[PDB]
Design a protein around this nucleic acid. Structure first.
Ligand SMILES: Nc1nc(=O)n([C@@H]2CS[C@H](COP(=O)(O)OP(=O)(O)OP(=O)(O)O)O2)cc1F
Ligand SMILES: [Mg+2]
Lengths: 983, 363, 358
DNA sequence: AAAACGAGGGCCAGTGCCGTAC
DNA sequence: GCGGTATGGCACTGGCCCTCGTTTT
C-alpha cells in the first residue's frame, strides 16, 4: 500500500506520471530476468506529525535552510573579498597577546581582534609542541599579530592548558575564519574546545581548491613528475594541494619563498627568537597568499557549487569535536606498554634465532645451509699503522704464601693500567661497527655511538627480508628467495628446460640439503609445480606462479600457516605465534605516532557547564577535556573528509592492540552521543540512478529492486544475500559488490573471491561466470555486437554509428557512463561539478572509473551535506542541546545529552527520511520505498563505536573500566515527537 | 632433564645426586651453589628494583621468623600485617600503600615428616575497597610482565584467574616446566578480615584516607617463590630440531646472570707485566660487574674447553688479555649469545659492559 | 636515652612500649625493625659483602639451612658453610686456601617461660693451612677493624681484644664502646680441623687441599659479625636543642628528600615527580615529602628529616618553574643553599662517590 | 715537511608492500 | 577493460655530501 511500497507523505499530492508503456517494459523485463515472486511483507507504516515545511518543494526547503545557515558567513566572506589591504608593518611587535597594526603599522596592544572575518595561519614550535608560538591574521580593516607566552625563558610544564590563541568575542553574526588547512588553526583556538558553542565557523582554501580544480592521487603522482595521448592537457589547469602551488595556480603571481631551514620543525625555541622578525614575515606572506587565493576561489567555488547545501554542509563539517578525559592518557600508557611488551618478545625470539645461527661461521660450514649463503659472512680486522721500530719480533716478546705488606701494589697495577690505556687511543680513529661479526650481523645491530643503543642484535623484523628466510620453511620446500618478488603465493602442456654449469667465481649454491629437507618433510622444475610445492636448482624464474606482484613477507597467511603448509622450523608453533604477534601490533605500528602525538586541551572546572558538575560525576579528581579532529573539509573524491588519524582509526577487534581508539571518545557526564550509519547509501544511490533513468518508479530495474527489498533486522540485505551464496559475510561481499560496480575485472574478482572463500579455482571461476551476467553484454575488425542486427557485411560505410556504447540486461552502468560522457559539469543531484582536470573537455579523458566513482561517491557526499544541514535545522529550532558534529563519510554522530537523546535520534530519523525523499525528488517521483526511508540502527551511548555491544583487547574488560552500555534503535524512538513535551 | 650435570659441574646447585623434582619443588634441597645463590641474589634484587624502589608508597618491612609464644612461619604476610599501623604513620594514612619483604619461609612436608624451607618475595598491598579488583588486575599484569621478561621464551609463563571458597578473587602464576605447569607466584584479594581480627578493640587506628573519607583497607597480597623462579629461569635458559650443530649453553638474561664477564690470560706464558689483569679486575668489580678470574689454571688446554666451561656458566662475555694488548691496548672479546671474536679497548670495554647491562635492563 | 624514642617516631624500630629497652634490643627478642632500620641494615650488609668481594683471590657466597637436616634451628653459621666445603673444593680446583661468606638470620634462646630471639649475622669461614693460619687471622683482624673504622664517626669507639684457650689456639673479639657498656660486635676464631674432621670421618682423603705440591688438611678461621649490633652501634655513633642522626652517606638509608614550598599546584608535583624519577634512575634513595599533604612548618620538617638521617633536603618553590633554581639544605652543616635542578643529580652522585675512601 | 684522491657513514628523497577506514 | 576514494607506516635503495685515512710535496 501502495505501488509496491510507499508511506504516508505530504511532499506533493501529484504525482503520477504513470508511464504505462515504461512500466510495461519494466514488468516484462523483471519477468524474463526474472523476478516475480513477491514476498508481500508490508513494513509497519508510521503516522507522525511532520515538522513545518516552508514550501514549495523540499528543494526550496533545504535551499532556504542552507542559505539562512550560511548567510552571515557569506556576508563575512564578501567582506573579505571587497577588502582593501593595508600594507604590512615595518616591524613586528615582540609582545604577548595580540597586536593591532592599523595606521602606518603602529603597535596597538590588544587582547582579542574584534573582526567580522579574517584570514589565519598559526605557528607552533615542534621542538616542544604542540603549543602555539606565533600567529598572524589580516582583516578588511587592519593587521594583527599574536605572540604566545613563550617570550620569557622559563621551565614550563605543558599539560595543555587554555594557552591556545583566543579569537572568539564575548557576549556578556558572528565570526568566520578562512585559511589554508584551517582545521589545524582551529585546533589552536582557545574557545573552540568548550563543550558548548559555537557561532564561529571556518572556511578552508585547500578544500575549496579541491572542490574547484582538484585531482586524484594518481594524477598527483605524475603531476609532480613534470620536472596517454591527450593526458597532458590538464597539467596546467590544476595543481597539487600545496600552498605555493595553489597560489601559483589561482593567483599566478611570483613564487612565494618557503623557510629554507624549516626552523619550526627542525630547530628549537632558542633559534626561533633569534629569527623572530623573519618568521613573522614568513607567516605574513602565508596569510597574504592565503587571502589572495581565497579571494580568487570564493566566486569560482560559488559558481561550480551553486547549491548552498554544499556550502553550509562544508561549514558544519569543519567544526568537529571529540570530548575525552584521563582515560585517554591511561589508554596511551597501557597500549604503548602492551606494544613494547609484544615487540620485546618478538625481537627477543628473532635475535635469539639470529645469535645461534651466527655460530656456523667457523669453519665455512655456512655454505651447506640452504637458507644462509646469500649474505656477507665477512671477517674484518682493521686497522693499524707502524710507528714503533725497529727489527725485533713483538709477537713472542705454584708457590703458596700469604703476603700483604705491599699495600700499595694495587695502585701500582692501577697506575700501570691507566698509563697503558692512554697510549693506544691515538692508534685508531673512528670507532666502526664490530668487524669480528659477519656483515649480515653488523647490519642487524645498532651503532655503538648511538644514543639509543640496545645490547645484542636489534632492529629485528617482521617485516624484514633477512629474518623470514632465516628460519621459515617454504611451502613444502626448503629455500625462499627474493629478486623482483619474494616467495610466490597469493597476491595443453607447458614445459621449461634446465641447466647446470660452473665457470668461477660466484657464490656456492647448495641443492642437496634442499632435496634432503624435502625428504624429511614428506617423511610423515617438473613435476610438482601446479598444486604441490618444490624448488628447482638455479635459473631463477616463475615456472608456475599465480600472483603478478609477490609478497615480502607473508604476514596475512594465518590460515595458510595453521593448516600445515607452510610452517617454520625451528620450530613447532613458533611460526603461527609469530604471525599472531605481527597481526596484533600491525595497527599500532603504523599509527602510534599519530595517536600519541594527538594533542588534547584540558578545560578547568571554571570553564565548563556547571550542569555537568551538578551531575553525580566529577569524577574523583578527574580531568575532562577534548580535541578537535582537525579535518580537511573537502578532499578528493568527492570533497570527502580527510583526516590523518580518526578516519583511518581501527574498529573494535579483540586482536589488535590499539583497537579501542574509536571507543575512547567518552562523552562528558550528563551528555551522551547519538549517531547513525546509512544502510545503505551508495548501493541504493546506484539503484536510483538506474530506475529513475529507466522509468519513473524505484523498482523498475533488476539491480535496483534487490537493494530496497532486504532488511538487516532478522532478515537479509542485498549484501547479505550475496554473502549467503555461499559466500562470505559480510564486509567481504560488500567489497565484492562495490568492487563489481566500479569495474568487475575477471582476474581481480577471481583472486578476490578465491581469497575470501578459500576453495578451488574451477568452481570459483564458475561462480564468477555466473555472477558476470550482470555486466553482460555491452557494445573493420571489432567486437561482434553493434547497432545493426548482424555484423557481417560487405563494404558497408557506417562510421557514424560507432559512437554509442552501453551494457545490457541487469545493471545500469549505462547511466554512470552517461554522466561520465558529458563534457559539461556532470552534476547529479545535487549538483556540484568538480575538477578542470577530470572534465572530459580538453582531457582524453581515460579516467572513467574515477569518474563513475566520482558520480556515486558525490551522491554520497551530497547525502552527507544534506544530513548535516537537516540535522542542524531542527536542532536550533527545537530545544535540543548539543549540536556538535562528528561524521565519518557514511556514519554520523552528534554529541547530545542524556535527557534529549531520544528526540535527537528522532531528528536523525527525520533527517534520513527527508534526505532520501530529496534524492527521490531530484529525479522523480517524490514517492519513495519503505525499507529505505528510515534508519535501521541508531547508536545512543557514552562512547562512540560500531555495535552497541563492545569488547576489547588492551583493557581486556570494557565495562570493567568506567563505561556503560549501548542501545539498538529501533522502533521505540518513534513515540517521542520533536516537541519538547514528551513522555 | 639432562642439564643437571651442568648444574653439578658448574655449581649453580648442590653436587648431590639426590636432587629430584620433588626435592627441589618442596624446598628440601641441601642448598644451592655459589652461582645459584648469586643468580637468586640478582633475581631477588631485580624483584626489589621493579617492585619497591620505582613505585612509591611501598616500604620494606622486617618480619620475624617465629612467634614469641616448634614450628615457624609458613608465610611472611602476617608479620607484615603486624606492622600496619606504624607504616600507616610514616605514610600519613595515605592508602593505597604496600609493604614488601624477601624472606625464607618454612613449609611442613609429609614425605610419602620433614620440613622444607624456601625463599619467598612477598608484597602486601593495602588498597581501598573501591579499587581492590583494579589493583589486583594491575599487579597481576605487572608481576606477569616482570616474569615474562628475562625469558628466552615468555610463552611458558601463564596466569590463571580463580576464586576463593567464599568468593574472593585471586590469580595464580604458572611456569611451563618440561613435565607440566607449576605454581611460582600467587595473588589474592583478602577482604580486610585478618586486619579486623588483629585489632578487635579500636578499629579507628585502621582507617585509611581514601581521599575525602577514611575507609577500612582491603588487603591485597602477592607472594612469589624465588626458588622455583630461579629454577624456572635456569630451565628456560637451556635449549630443538634440524639445527645440524649443537652446543651446550644456558642463555640467562644478562641482568640476572651470576657472572657477567670472564677475565683470562692468553699467550701465555708472559711475564711479568700481567699485573694489568689485577687492574682491570679491581676496575671491573668497582663498577659492580661480576668478573671470573682466569689466573691460576691447570689448563693449558683447548680454548673450546674453557669457552664451553664459560657457556655452561652463562657468562656473557669472555675478555682475553694477551701480549699484543700489552703492546698496543686492544684486548679480545667473545660473546655468549653469538660466539665471535672481537677486538676492543680497555676503558671502552668497561663502559661497554656497563652500557650493556644498563641497556639490557631497558627494552 | 632520648635516642630510643626518636627511632620509634621515625620508624627505625618497630612499635613497642615495654620491649623498647636496651636489654631487649641487645636481646634477639623483637619487635623487629622499621623500614629505616631495614634499609640501614641492607646498606650495611651490602657494604659488608662489598668489603669481602674486593678480597683476593675468590670467596664464594653460600646459603645454609635454618632447621636441622635430620629433623633444631641453627645457632652458629659455620656448619652450613662446612657442608659445602668439599663441593666448593672443585670450583677453586683445590688450588689455594679459600673462604665462604654468608649473611643469615641465626637464632639464640632468650631467658615465667623462656623465649627465642633472632639476630641477622654475617659470617666468613676462611680455610687456610695451619702454618699460615695465625697470620691470616691477624690479617682479617686488621681488615675487619678497618671495616668498622671506615663508616665510624669515631675509631676509638671500636676496640679489638685478644684471647685464647685450649680449644681455640688464638682468637680475637671486636668490641664496641657505647659507653653504657662495651659490647660484643664480632668474633674471630681459629678453629682447628677437629670441627671439620668430626663431620667427615672418613675417609678424610677428600678434606686435605693442595698447598704448593703439598697435601694438608686446612685449619679453619671463623669470622662472625653482627649486623644488628652494628646497626645499633652506628645509630649510637650518629646521635648528636638539635637532635640529628649523622649516619655515613654510603650507609644512610634515605640520602635525600624533596618537598614543595608554593601552595598545592599540579605543576610542582610534576617537577617533583620528574626529579624523583631522575634521582631514582641513578640509584639515589629519595623520600617523597611532596605528596604531601599540607607542608606545615619548615623547622619541624628539617627536624624530622634530620632525625631520619637525610643527607640533603630539597625544596621546590614556584621560582623553580621559572629559573630552575632549587633550595638545597645540608645536614652536617645545615647550610641553606640554592642550585639549578639539572646539576643536582651530578652533585649528589659526586658527593656519595667522594665518601669512598679508606 | 705539504697537496690530492679514495673509503666510510649519515642525511636526504624515492620506491615497493602493507596497515586501516569509508 | 580497468573497484573507487582517502590516511599512514616500514624496509630497501642509491645518490648527495662529508669525513678520515692513505698516499704524496
Ligand atoms: N570497499 C568499499 N568501497 C566503498 O566505496 N564503500 C563505500 C564508501 S561509502 C559507503 C559507506 O560504507 P559502508 O561501510 O557503511 O557500507 P554500506 O553503507 O554500503 O553498508 P552498511 O550500511 O554499513 O551496512 O560504501 C565502502 C566500502 F567498504
Ligand atoms: Mg560508511
Amino acid at each position: 500500500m501502495l505501488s509496491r511500497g510507499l508511506h504516508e507523505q505530504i511532499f506533493g499530492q501529484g504525482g503520477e506520471m504513470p508511464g504505462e508503456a515504461a512500466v510495461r517494459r519494466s514488468v516484462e523485463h523483471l519477468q524474463k530476468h526474472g523476478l516475480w515472486g513477491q514476498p508481500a511483507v508490508p513494513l509497519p507504516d508510521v503516522e507522525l506529525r511532520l515538522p513545518p515545511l516552508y514550501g514549495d518543494n523540499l528543494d526550496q526547503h533545504f535551499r532556504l535552510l542552507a542559505q539562512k545557515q550560511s548567510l552571515p558567513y557569506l556576508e563575512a566572506a564578501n567582506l573579505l573579498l571587497q577588502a582593501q589591504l593595508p600594507p604590512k608593518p615595518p616591524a613586528w611587535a615582540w609582545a604577548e597577546g595580540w597586536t593591532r597594526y592599523g595606521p602606518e603599522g603602529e603597535a596597538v596592544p590588544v587582547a582579542i581582534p574584534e573582526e567580522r572575518a579574517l584570514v589565519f595561519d598559526v605557528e607552533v614550535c615542534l621542538a616542544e609542541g604542540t603549543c602555539p608560538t606565533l600567529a598572524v591574521a589580516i582583516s578588511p580593516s587592519a593587521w594583527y599579530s599574536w605572540c604566545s607566552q613563550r617570550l620569557v625563558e622559563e621551565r614550563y610544564s605543558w599539560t595543555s592548558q587554555l594557552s591556545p590563541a583566543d579569537l572568539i568575542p564575548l557576549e556578556v553574526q558572528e565570526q568566520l575564519v578562512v585559511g589554508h588547512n584551517v582545521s589545524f588553526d582551529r585546533a589552536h583556538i582557545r574557545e573552540q574546545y568548550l563543550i558548548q558553542g559555537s557561532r564561529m565557523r571556518f572556511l578552508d582554501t585547500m578544500s575549496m581548491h579541491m572542490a574547484i580544480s582538484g585531482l586524484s592521487s594518481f594524477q598527483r603522482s605524475l603531476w609532480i613528475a613534470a620536472k596517454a595521448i591527450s593526458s597532458w592537457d590538464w597539467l596546467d589547469i590544476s595543481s597539487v594541494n600545496s600552498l605555493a602551488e595553489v597560489h601559483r595556480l589561482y593567483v599566478g603571481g611570483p613564487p612565494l619563498e618557503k623557510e629554507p631551514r624549516e626552523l619550526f620543525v627542525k630547530g628549537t625555541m632558542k633559534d626561533i627568537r633569534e629569527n623572530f622578525q623573519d618568521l613573522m614575515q614568513y607567516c605574513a606572506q602565508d596569510v597574504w597568499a592565503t587571502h589572495e587565493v581565497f579571494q580568487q576561489q570564493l566566486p569560482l567555488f560559488l559558481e561550480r557549487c551553486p547549491h548552498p547545501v554544499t556550502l553550509a554542509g562544508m561549514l558544519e563539517m569543519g567544526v568537529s569535536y571529540l570530548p575525552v578525559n584521563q582515560n585517554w592518557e591511561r589508554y596511551l600508557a597501557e597500549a604503548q606498554g602492551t606494544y613494547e611488551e609484544l615487540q620485546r618478545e618478538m625481537k627477543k625470539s628473532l635475535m635469539d634465532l639470529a645469535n645461534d645461527a651466527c655460530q656456523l661461521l667457523s669453519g665455512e660450514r655456512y655454505k651447506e645451509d640452504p637458507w644462509l649463503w646469500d649474505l656477507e659472512w665477512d671477517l674484518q680486522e682493521f686497522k693499524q699503522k707502524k710507528a714503533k721500530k725497529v727489527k725485533k719480533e713483538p709477537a713472542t716478546a705454584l708457590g703458596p704464601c700469604s703476603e700483604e705488606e705491599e699495600f700499595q701494589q694495587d695502585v701500582m697495577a692501577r697506575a700501570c693500567l691507566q698509563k697503558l690505556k692512554g697510549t693506544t687511543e691515538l692508534l685508531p680513529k673512528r670507532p666502526q661497527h664490530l668487524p669480528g661479526h659477519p656483515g649480515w650481523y653488523r647490519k642487524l645491530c645498532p651503532r655503538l655511538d648511538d644514543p639509543a643503543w640496545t645490547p645484542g642484535p636489534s632492529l629485528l623484523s617482521l617485516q624484514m627480508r633477512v629474518t623470514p628466510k632465516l628460519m621459515a620453511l617454504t611451502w613444502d620446500g626448503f629455500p625462499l628467495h627474493y629478486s623482483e618478488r619474494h616467495g610466490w603465493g597469493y597476491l595443453n602442456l607447458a614445459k621449461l628446460p634446465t641447466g647446470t654449469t660452473l665457470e668461477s667465481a660466484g657464490v656456492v649454491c647448495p641443492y642437496r640439503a634442499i632435496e634432503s629437507l624435502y625428504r624429511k618433510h614428506c617423511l610423515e622444475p617438473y613435476n610438482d609445480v601446479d598444486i604441490p610445492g618444490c624448488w628447482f636448482f638455479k635459473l631463477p624464474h616463475k615456472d608456475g606462479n599465480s600472483c603478478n606482484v609477490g609478497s615480502p613477507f607473508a604476514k596475512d597467511f594465518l590460515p595458510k600457516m595453521e593448516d600445515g603448509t607452510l610452517q617454520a622450523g625451528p620450530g613447532g608453533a613458533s611460526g603461527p605465534r609469530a604471525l599472531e604477534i605481527n597481526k596484533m601490533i600491525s595497527f599500532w605500528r603504523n599509527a602510534h605516532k599519530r595517536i600519541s602525538s594527538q594533542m588534547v586541551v584540558w578545560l578547568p572546572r571554571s570553564a565548563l557547564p556547571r550542569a555537568v558538575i551538578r551531575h553525580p560525576d566529577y569524577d574523583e579528581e578527574g580531568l575532562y577535556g577534548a580535541i578537535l579532529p582537525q579535518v580537511v573539509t573537502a578532499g578528493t573524491i568527492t570533497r570527502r573528509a580527510v583526516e590523518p588519524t580518526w578516519l583511518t582509526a581501527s574498529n573494535a577487534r579483540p586482536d589488535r592492540v590499539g583497537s579501542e581508539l574509536k571507543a575512547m571518545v567518552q562523552a562528558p557526564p550528563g551528555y551522551t552521543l547519538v549517531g547513525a550509519d546509512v544502510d545503505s547509501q551508495e548501493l541504493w544511490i546506484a539503484a536510483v540512478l538506474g530506475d529513475a533513468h529507466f522509468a519513473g518508479m524505484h523498482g523498475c530495474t533488476a539491480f535496483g529492486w534487490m537493494t530496497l527489498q532486504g532488511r538487516k533486522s532478522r532478515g537479509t540485505d542485498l549484501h547479505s544475500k550475496t554473502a549467503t551464496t555461499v559466500g562470505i559475510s559480510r564486509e567481504h561481499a560488500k567489497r565484492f559488490n562495490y568492487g563489481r560496480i566500479y569495474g568487475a575485472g575477471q582476474p581481480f574478482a577471481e583472486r578476490l573471491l578465491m581469497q575470501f572463500n578459500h576453495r578451488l579455482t574451477q568452481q570459483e571461476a564458475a561462480e564468477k561466470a555466473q555472477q558476470m551476467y550482470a555486466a553482460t553484454k555491452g557494445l573493420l575488425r571489432k567486437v561482434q555486437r553493434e547497432t545493426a542486427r548482424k555484423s557481417q557485411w560487405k563494404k558497408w560505410e557506417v562510421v557514424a554509428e560507432r559512437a554509442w556504447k552501453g551494457g545490457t540486461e541487469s545493471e545500469m552502468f549505462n547511466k554512470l557512463e552517461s554522466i561520465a560522457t558529458s563534457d559539461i559539469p556532470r552534476t547529479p543531484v545535487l549538483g556540484c561539478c568538480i575538477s578542470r582536470a577530470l572534465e572530459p573537455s580538453a582531457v582524453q579523458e581515460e579516467f572513467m572509473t574515477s569518474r563513475v566513482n566520482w558520480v556515486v561517491q558525490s551522491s554520497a557526499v551530497d547525502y552527507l551535506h544534506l544530513m548535516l544541514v537537516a540535522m542542524k535545522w531542527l536542532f536550533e529550532e527545537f530545544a535540543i542541546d548539543g549540536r556538535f558534529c562528528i561524521s565519518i563519510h557514511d556514519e554520523v554522530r552528534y554529541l547530545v545529552r542524556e535527557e534529549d537523546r531520544y528526540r535527537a535520534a528522532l531528528a536523525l530519523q527525520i533527517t534520513n527520511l527527508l534526505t532520501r525523499c530529496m534524492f527521490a525528488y531530484k529525479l522523480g517521483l517524490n514517492d519513495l520505498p519503505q525499507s529505505v526511508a528510515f534508519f535501521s540502527a541508531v547508536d545512543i551511548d557514552r562512547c562512540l563505536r560500531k555495535e552497541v555491544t563492545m569488547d576489547c583487547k588492551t583493557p581486556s574488560n570494557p565495562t570493567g573500566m568506567e563505561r556503560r552500555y549501548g542501545i539498538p534503535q529501533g522502533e521505540a524512538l518513534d513515540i517521542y515527537q520533536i516537541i519538547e513535551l514528551t513522555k | 632433564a639432562l642439564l643437571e650435570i651442568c648444574q653439578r659441574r658448574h655449581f649453580l646447585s648442590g653436587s648431590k645426586q639426590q636432587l629430584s623434582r620433588d626435592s627441589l619443588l618442596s624446598g628440601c634441597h641441601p642448598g644451592f651453589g655459589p652461582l645459584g645463590v648469586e643468580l637468586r641474589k640478582n633475581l631477588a634484587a631485580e624483584w626489589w628494583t621493579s617492585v619497591v624502589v620505582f613505585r612509591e608508597q611501598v616500604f620494606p618491612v622486617d618480619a620475624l621468623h617465629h612467634k614469641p609464644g616448634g614450628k615457624l612461619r609458613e608465610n611472611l604476610l602476617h608479620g607484615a600485617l603486624e606492622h600496619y599501623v606504624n607504616c600507616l604513620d610514616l605514610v600519613n594514612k595515605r592508602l593505597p600503600y604496600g609493604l614488601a619483604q624477601i624472606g625464607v619461609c618454612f613449609h611442613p612436608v609429609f614425605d610419602t615428616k620433614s620440613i622444607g624451607e624456601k625463599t619467598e618475595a612477598s608484597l602486601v598491598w593495602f588498597t581501598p575497597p573501591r579499587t581492590s579488583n583494579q589493583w589486583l588486575d594491575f599487579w597481576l599484569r605487572h608481576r606477569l610482565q616482570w616474569w615474562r621478561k628475562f625469558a628466552m621464551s615468555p610463552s611458558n609463563f601463564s596466569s590463571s584467574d580463580c576464586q576463593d571458597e567464599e568468593g574472593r578473587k585471586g590469580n595464580k602464576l604458572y611456569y611451563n616446566f618440561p613435565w607440566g605447569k607449576e605454581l611460582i607466584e600467587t595473588l589474592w584479594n583478602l577482604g580486610d578480615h585478618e586486619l579486623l581480627h588483629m585489632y578487635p578493640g579500636n578499629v579507628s587506628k585502621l582507617h585509611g584516607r581514601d581521599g575525602r573519607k577514611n575507609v577500612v583497607p582491603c588487603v591485597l597480597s602477592v607472594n612469589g617463590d624465588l626458588d622455583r623462579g630461579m629454577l624456572a629461569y635456569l630451565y628456560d635458559s637451556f635449549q630443538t630440531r634440524k639445527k645440524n650443530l649443537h652446543r651446550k649453553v644456558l642463555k640467562l638474561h644478562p641482568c640476572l646472570a651470576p657472572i657477567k664477564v670472564a677475565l683470562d690470560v692468553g699467550r701465555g706464558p708472559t711475564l711479568e707485566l700481567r699485573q694489568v689483569c689485577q687492574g682491570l679486575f679491581n676496575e671491573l668489580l668497582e663498577n659492580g660487574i661480576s668478573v671470573w678470574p682466569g689466573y691460576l689454571e691447570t689448563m693449558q688446554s683447548s680454548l673450546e674447553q674453557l669457552y664451553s666451561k664459560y657457556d655452561e656458566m652463562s657468562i656473557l662475555f669472555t675478555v682475553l688479555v694477551t701480549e699484543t694488548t700489552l703492546e698496543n691496548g686492544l684486548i679480545h672479546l667473545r660473546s655468549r649469545d653469538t660466539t665471535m671474536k672481537e677486538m676492543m679497548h680497555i676503558s671502552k670495554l668497561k663502559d661497554f659492559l656497563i652500557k650493556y647491562i644498563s641497556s639490557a635492563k631497558n627494552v
